[PDB]
């Protein structure tokens, strides 16, 4: 049934799905926020190569 | 060689899952156009991991 | 050493083994084969560099 | 097999590229002699009563 | 396949993608990193091999998952922009 990310169902799996879309929303945010910053984590990456 | 199998299988399943959660399709059609959606991916994948 | 004494490596010193001889050449042409197939899948030359 | 080879340019490129890589190795690994090996086998026993 | 199928300039394409892939990546990884804990765990009777295979795999896996999960969305946009 379209859209259901298993939220309002039983006990732990529901809170897991909720906390999940929570976490990947916060993620898409975080990486949208590392998106505005092209050239910083480039310094980090090259350091990593070293 | 247990990790690159489950990756293929899970890709195949999870993309249809997502497609159905998001589009409200019947399973076989969901996959009939979600398989027609990740094909060349796993393909080149197989032609590059090798 | 005195005139008439020669030397030779047999056994484990004949062969010489693995990483440091030409094994990164294997990793290398493996990588060249990979970027090739990625220029096949993306039909770019940059995009595989991602 | 033309109009798709015609549409995706580098695909064929990569194919040729490959064919050359191969034939180029198979030159290095190939031993240069005069012609082919032509004669029947001749085995030969050889003793001396001095 | 969001750009040459829809028409999305990379800035929104990339993020929609990394969200559409954010679950599978995580599963394959959380399944594998556990899967190779058998290796890194066994003591006695075949360890050496099991371990030396396992740990390289596990470590190598936890880093290239938590890092490329941030870098790859950028790997694209850095390579995509400069050259087109």
Curated annotation (Swiss-Prot), chain E:
Subcellular location: Cell inner membrane
Disruption phenotype: Loss of susceptibility to contact-dependent growth inhibition (CDI); inhibiting cells still contact the target.
Signal peptide residue numbers: none
Topological region Cytoplasmic: 1-22
Superkingdom, taxonomy of origin: Bacteria
Transmembrane segments: 23-42, 49-68
Periplasmic face residues: 43-48
Induction context: Positively regulated by MarA, Rob and SoxS transcriptional regulators (at protein level).
Function, as annotated: AcrA-AcrB-AcrZ-TolC is a drug efflux protein complex with broad substrate specificity that uses the proton motive force to export substrates.
Family indicated by similarity: Belongs to the resistance-nodulation-cell division (RND) (TC 2.A.6) family.
Subunit organization: Homotrimer, with large domains that extend into the periplasm, interacts with AcrA and TolC. AcrA may be required to stably link this protein and TolC. Interacts with AcrZ. Part of the AcrA-AcrB-AcrZ-TolC efflux pump.
Name of the molecule in the record: Multidrug efflux pump subunit AcrB
Gene: acrB
Stretch of the intact protein here: 951 to 1034 of 1049
